[model samples]
Target: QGPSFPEPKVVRSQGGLLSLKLSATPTPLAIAGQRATLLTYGGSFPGPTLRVRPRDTVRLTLENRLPEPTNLHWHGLPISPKVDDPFLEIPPGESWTYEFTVPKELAGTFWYHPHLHGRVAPQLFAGLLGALVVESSLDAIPELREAEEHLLVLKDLALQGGRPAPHTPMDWMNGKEGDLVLVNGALRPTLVAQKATLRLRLLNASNARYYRLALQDHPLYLIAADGGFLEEPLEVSELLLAPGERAEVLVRLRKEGRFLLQALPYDRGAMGMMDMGGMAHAMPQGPSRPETLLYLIAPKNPKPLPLPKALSPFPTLPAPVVTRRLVLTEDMMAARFFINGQVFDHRRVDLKGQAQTVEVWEVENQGDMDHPFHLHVHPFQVLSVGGRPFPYRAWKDVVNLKAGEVARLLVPLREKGRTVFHCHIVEHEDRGMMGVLEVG
Candidate 1:
């Protein structure tokens, strides 16, 4: 083994409450073969795994010890902004408390990170994100009960002179990728499969890296999407997750050998050349190859668990009361982005709707590259994509729109408050492609 595999610390809720005090601070640690200081949550890179049960009250207090303004966003949770708001900014030395009860209907793998508008990308790049898992009895079912569970938070680190590298012009134009892909805060962590089945919860915690994951000769049975479980198990040869997305997949350990879970290169279309002063050529092009993300060493005499017949039933979707259209665009020349031809404004409410009403959002992307669309607080179901019916219904928070693609989403406004929907590619979101929505 080149380096010891790593896993983030786990914190479980006691009784009916999960209380945590997370402080953003700088601490020195070895990373990417260098001794460097990383901005983290109480010195925890990739943060801690916060586990809670459904209906459990989670009271989290955040201390901004880092030298900047920061706020927290509980991605994909259907909670009120009064509890988890991005606009609640915290300057240095100040703290804020976020309290909310996880609704019984919501139980899946979610995440938390800095949601400050302009600083989201850099802060996340510097290491300030973690996993939030809501427990469910479905895990104890016959198909999954015996499997070993693992939480993989996928993030990357781009270093310069032993420190995290700042964004380049290309990075600003396109969202940045890292020098190395880190799985659970370590490079190529090896997990042992001592039993017959393995349950992996993968969180795409990076700023903008897309993961096209595949396990050779093994089928990835997708049990949960971004928000939660599907109606039944969906088997696929590979699974792809964009930024801020999560997936729970089960793999049967049949062969007694090392199985590599790799990320194959995905084409996000041409980003063209950057205007670097006088040079006409682009610098620092990305790699075009498959890279190993992690390894699973399987034991002999495997007894595979059967796939469950029913995981969860789909919710009844209400008819749309209104229709809204939004377009995503990019100004590569100026490194600016827009949604519906307007940049984001914090105080200006771009959209207003009623609470608990279902609406149809026809979102179109005109940019040359793919942009993953994300809406805060509530998750939506894909009705159609590219003028075709979506194959299956899954509650999703982030939907990847390829260049010139259109998606029709059925969004039900559950909680009433201030929120926004934008591109999940963090750099684009930081630039301008976001819109504020108010529901009352």
Candidate 2:
């Protein structure tokens, strides 16, 4: 028999002090009746879910018991380099205490993971990730407060010989995609709920795969994006989420039946091509079909609530003091990727700006494949996509750029120090598709 669903451990903040011992350990994971040992934090796949409120101080004691050096990155938090920095590396058998206060402006879904260069993909693929929820005004809404909540951590795993497979060069080039799809580290898991409204927080933590999430026979009321709540709820049938992205949606279960939350198959356009020495090669596709992430079953008697019209107010960004342009490209022959025509250099300060100033960034994707552009230290507002202005503004830390796509962002440089922006695909970031931004 296949293994049942595995719910990750949840750790709620106690008086704003969130402490945990993070260490790698061998855990038995059985999928489809095949048992394998994989590396994980706190002995659980997808790690633990940490919940805290805005303006709360977080004290995290990260202990690295693994054989490799690692550090943590607080994605989507606007903190100074001294606190939210990713360059602080902790060696093996070392413990590092991270203390940072959540910004009052920050609220919504965020996550934490190892951000060490060259080893991020392997460590993430081996199960070292967790969810971070920052409370905000959305919790005060009567509908959302009374609704049943579920946090879905979407991930995919590459398995070989009944064990987690190692990455290959080709995998690095095209970005690793797993054959099996999982939700909170469970395969085809079923969720039982009464007929009522449910709040679903979705976090995409995959190394490479992009998910087009759709619930069968239901429409998703999107209330929040990566950084925080949207101005108003958006009703849609499907939502596309790239790596390092999150979405909070509200759904009502009216009828009693088996409904599935599935990830629809996506076409990566021209970016799926692989290079084999001097020859063009393509890897064999493995069951490139729609996969069910969660099966929702409810009773016949359902009590559905009215969806909220507005979640929160959108912040007004300051007037732009500067504008910067960045181009995303790749050299297939040399197998090197770049941001703004330059490969990632730790010592090189790519773009400089004054802290507390607002700037406009024009990011153009001149590559063959899609790249999810992610920034550190500050979240940005989507001014436009493909030169067309969005009807409404939404705060986001990660934006997906398709081939030939151009995105405009209004970013407020609130945090000072050196931080990096790169493709959220860990392999691409490690392969030099990144740049460092210096804000003073």
Candidate 3:
């Protein structure tokens, strides 16, 4: 989350086609302090909101002017980091062009951010993230309208002022905490609206903390999760979102009022706590708990918008050829987190399986707090929560492993690469809550 992406009024202008510049700089904020590093899209956080119709050829020139060599990962997109790959990454002082035809398969709220190995946490926290909105000419999903659509991108930070905490092994050892929360880079920002239909595109961009999203007044009519819309609408009071996970919901504003969207602490318990006493880190006062990322206030009566009961049919994936179990455990005494008693190593490939094979992965969060478990390269489906499969369990990419909770994921490996699977909690991943799986 370092630098901001530029937002040109138009994608093309005179002189030449418009380009986006993303870099990291030091930013000082009063509320959170002067500790923020400017990771901007067109020069600000939440980057430019990209709107493209399906099958449209999109081109973006990226300049990585940051201090480090970086790569960009189009979260939830079928992108590649390899040579001739449609996706692009750049070194410091370098630039790359991204070209791809927006696939019809992708028609929803997505995101693009830095995916540099070993540096994603710092860069992401620095603020280098943005939203990608894919649309279609004939699509009738009312949730896509900007009037009804509320783009909420949430992130956690560790600050001394608004600036990023110094990068260190110790910083990684202790979990990061942000004193303030930003929604579209505003504090307790209010949404402009009237008593009508409101669609919310929620993205949990936090490195480690998982979010339980709920509205105080209206029920969340869940139209989509992660990748896109579900076959039917799901109305629930709360939604649990982890790092890199997303949810799109439609709230019916029957009357003129202000509603608060809150993300409460969803801690998994003591097992989620890290003992850094020997590491020379001091624990803050009170119990260790996750904090709120932001708040949303629905505006008073302004306009009216229609609601959609359904968006798309459920997607079908191939049957999993194999089922694997990776039990999460912690070595509290050693300050080590492990999968099956072994810590994560980037060089070693732990799981080798056939390509395009459907695999069932069972992840048991044996510790406390919430570990937003994530898998790189492949976006899988959540088969069950606490062993009970949801109707749209097949639509999840990131799953929250609450304390003592076990989740089953049905991942269809369609691409070949040395990908990573780990807790999305950046600190935890840095402290070895990761495993490697190579598909060939």
1 against 3, candidate with superior TM-score: 1
Cα lDDT of model 1 by residue, 1-440, tens digit: 33344878889999999998988898788775678788898678889889998999999999999989999989998999778787888999999988999899887899999889998888989999999998888888878788778888999888876667898887888888886898987888787777778888999998888889999779899999999898888899999888999999988878788889998888765375645566544543444368899888887888888888989898889899999999999998688999999999999998898998999999999988789999998799998889999766779999989889999999999899999998888889899999998988
What would the TM-scores of all predictions be? 0.95, 0.93, 0.81
Which candidate tops TM-score? Answer: 1
**Which lDDT values do the candidates have, in the order given?**
0.87, 0.83, 0.65
| Pick by lDDT: 2 or 3, better one | 2
Model 3 ranges with Cα > 4 A deviation: 1-37, 81-90, 136-147, 167-174, 270-306, 332-335, 391-394
Q: For every model in order, what is the number of clashing pairs?
A: 0, 0, 41
Better of 1 and 3 by lDDT: 1
